[PDB]
Structure 1
């Protein structure tokens, strides 16, 4: 299932794949998860994250 993303918290490479640590809109921080970049439909957040780090 797809869910609204509040913000990208962190980025990493694991097993050769880029993953983003996500805060989910309306869910607590305890539910943050690492998601492979192809799970994301968050062009604006990704571009903003990759621009500010």
Structure 2
């Protein structure tokens, strides 16, 4: 339900890919790990996954 600024990092937890997100217009203290299925940011995921 929130705009995503950028993906900071990626991990696997409990067999799920999770991304650590900076949320647009929120402080870095609000950064959270979210499971990949929670994202609708194809362009960011591909840009992250291509450049990592």
The TM-score bracket by the shorter chain reads over 0.9
For structure 2, the 5+ residue unaligned runs are none
> Shift of residue 44 of structure 1?
0.2
Q: How many residues align?
A: 52
Runs of 4+ more than 3 Å apart: none
> RMSD of the alignment, in Å?
0.2
| TM-score, normalisation: structure 1 | 0.98
For structure 1, the 5+ residue unaligned runs are none
1:12-47 CA distance string (max 9 Å, x none): 000000000000000000000000000000000000
